[PDB]
Amino acid sequence: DLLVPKLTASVTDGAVGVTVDAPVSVTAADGVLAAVTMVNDNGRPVAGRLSPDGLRWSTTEQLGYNRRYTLNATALGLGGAATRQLTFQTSSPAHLTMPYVMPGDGEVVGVGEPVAIRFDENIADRGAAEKAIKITTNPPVEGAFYWLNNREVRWRPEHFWKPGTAVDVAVNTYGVDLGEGMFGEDNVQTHFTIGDEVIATADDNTKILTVRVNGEVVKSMPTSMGKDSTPTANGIYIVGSRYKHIIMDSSTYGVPVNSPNGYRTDVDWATQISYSGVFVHSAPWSVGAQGHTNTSHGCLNVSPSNAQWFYDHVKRGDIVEVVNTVGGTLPGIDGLGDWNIPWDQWRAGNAK
Amino acid sequence: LLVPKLTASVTDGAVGVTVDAPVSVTAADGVLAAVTMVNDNGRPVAGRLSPDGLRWSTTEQLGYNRRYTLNATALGLGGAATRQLTFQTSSPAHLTMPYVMPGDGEVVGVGEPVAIRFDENIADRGAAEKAIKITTNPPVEGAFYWLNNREVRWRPEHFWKPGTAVDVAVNTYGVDLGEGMFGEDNVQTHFTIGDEVIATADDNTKILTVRVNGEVVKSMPTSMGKDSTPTANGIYIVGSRYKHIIMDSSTYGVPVNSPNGYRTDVDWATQISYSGVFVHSAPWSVGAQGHTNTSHGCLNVSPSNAQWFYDHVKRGDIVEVVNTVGGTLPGIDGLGDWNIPWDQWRAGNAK
Ligand SMILES: *CC(=O)[C@H]1O[C@@H]1c1ccccc1
């Protein structure tokens, strides 16, 4: 009279819709696992590993969608043996969606850079997407998720990041039902660091763009912003990509070139600060207007010299704030206007 | 013509007849004229003959440790038939009474498990599980798991969906629960799942955020257990609510006179673990709430936030703790059912 080994698996025989966001395990009690195999609906075996003590076996590669797996396990012991065969089917997505995360892995970014997770499909279950995203911060700081549209979600703290903060983003979305049968195509995993505090302020009262590094003025640039008919909106702008030169085409923003407010001109040293088309760029033609009157379509015109300096000394995530213009406020969902949404609204989020 | 034939759901001379079902008498090639059943004291058992005269059944429950005598007369085209049966019902060595939670008619949160607590150790856990019928609308899969030798729990893999109906039929009367132990009685309870309410206490931020149906409705600065007596991570099920309570550490195994012991009156206390973790009013730690941990394990919040928790949270709601320096709440705590992985829970420990 002795104990008979028992077998415990993380799946049920006959189970359907098994999610592939976790390994499949099989455990032996009152005995050890003598043989554990697992094959798919073809013949190919599934990779796995057994613990040295012989009690725990797990798969070591990710399991695929739309697969029927067959699991055979045998357990031995002083008091007998036990064998079990289990077959189960994994999730069968209706559609797949792949996430993309910014900033890039290893980047050093300014204090205003939000964590960004953009999917290539609409997300029916935003809560499920948020649950699947794990964000670590050192030093730890509370942030919250907020959706700019149906496909991109952002995560940021109440105030600007503290320089030196380490941020780690893991979007563990493979095998996760993101709503209406849409499952994540894969996981993504990026890490970045917050750099120096760089805040540039363009004051319409003075028509000056002052760059502050760690709270001290390092550059004062005369500027000409949008005229009354096409003014530059007030608010907080997040610096984005930087270009040695770029063709500013209004058609990419929905405004034809031939229309009154349209344009197509090649400019130098252009730093993007809004998705709606606001740049800090070289503007030789308005050097005389810079510091006095507004003549552009919204962009912050500066001298070629100050434009190259801005390009060289400003990095993705730095902040450009505009105040006292005749325009409104930059939309919070512009894509670089995250900080214009009041914190209570951002904190509460819009997972619905 | 044919002499009618009389058959019964019991047979003459039977012993150990279980009283979980009624006794019946059926006629073939004829009809029943009369059926009488009496116990050993000569008291008749209430019974009902079907309109067609073919089937007779007891209409009251039969007792343990009883000898019943059944007499049936039948008439057919070929003549009459008569029969007399005698049988003896189960003679339990012991009886056990079940207790079922939550209460009948209640509205509970999405983490509320079905509970059946017997007042004796159950030697045949499989027999008790087989005798408990759970109905859910909308239907959802669930499984049994035993916290101790006397209490068994039933829950789904994921939290309940709001609006779900749950019907529990503990049909243990007349059932052998092992080693001659039989159910003292049956129990029936029905309850409903209300709004989804999930409160997350994050130790990295030291905020207790209450979400009702996915919407942030309250943010409470909190002070959890200090390093020496930390608040454990994991999922807590909300239990009882107290306008005021005497926190006594001996109730949870720690002598009051010991270093980690305590005995203080506390306002607006919501229990979330049998181990003694509460959400309660802590005016003495208002400065530390949202900054540092200073408690014995409880979630300290301000008086206004404690009372708010008392009013808007109900039995079955969820409090989840994360990023603390403690361990994970035991799955068999009594309110930590969800800390058991579904595979371990579904497999069960019925043996
Ligand atoms: C965003 C802007 O207002 C600048 O790109 C605008 C432009 C530059 C040069 C000529 C015409 C328009």
Numbering used by the authors:
A (entry chain A): 56 to 407
B (entry chain B): 57 to 407
The authors write:
The L,D-transpeptidase LdtMt2 of Mycobacterium tuberculosis, which is a target for TB treatment, is amenable to covalent inhibition via reaction with its catalytic cysteine. We report αβ,α′β′-diepoxyketones (DEKs) as a new type of mechanism-based inhibitors of nucleophilic cysteine enzymes. Studies with the l,d-transpeptidase LdtMt2 from Mycobacterium tuberculosis and the main protease from SARS-CoV-2 (Mpro) reveal that following epoxide ring opening by a nucleophilic cysteine, further reactions can occur, leading to irreversible alkylation. Here, we describe the identification of the small molecule trans,trans αβ,α′β′-diepoxyketone (DEK) 1, and the potency and mechanism of 1 and related DEKs 4–12 for LdtMt2 and SARS-CoV-2 Mpro inhibition; the results reveal DEKs as a mechanistically interesting class of electrophile.
DEK 1 exhibited potent inhibition of LdtMt2, with a pIC50 of 7.2 ± 0.1, with 30 min pre-incubation. The results reveal that 1 covalently reacts with LdtMt2, giving an initial adduct with a +267 Da mass shift relative to unmodified LdtMt2 (ESI†), corresponding to addition of one molecule of 1 to LdtMt2, which has a single cysteine (Cys354). This adduct was transient, converting within 2 h into one with a mass shift of +160 Da relative to unmodified LdtMt2, provisionally assigned as 3. As reported, LdtMt2 crystallised with two molecules (chains A and B) in the asymmetric unit. To investigate whether the DEKs react selectively with Cys-354 of LdtMt2, we performed protein-observed SPE-MS assays with LdtMt2 that had been preincubated with ebselen, which is known to selectively and irreversibly react with Cys354.16 When 1 and 4–10 were combined with the LdtMt2-ebselen complex, no reaction was observed, evidencing that inhibition arises from at least partially, selective reaction with Cys354 (ESI†).
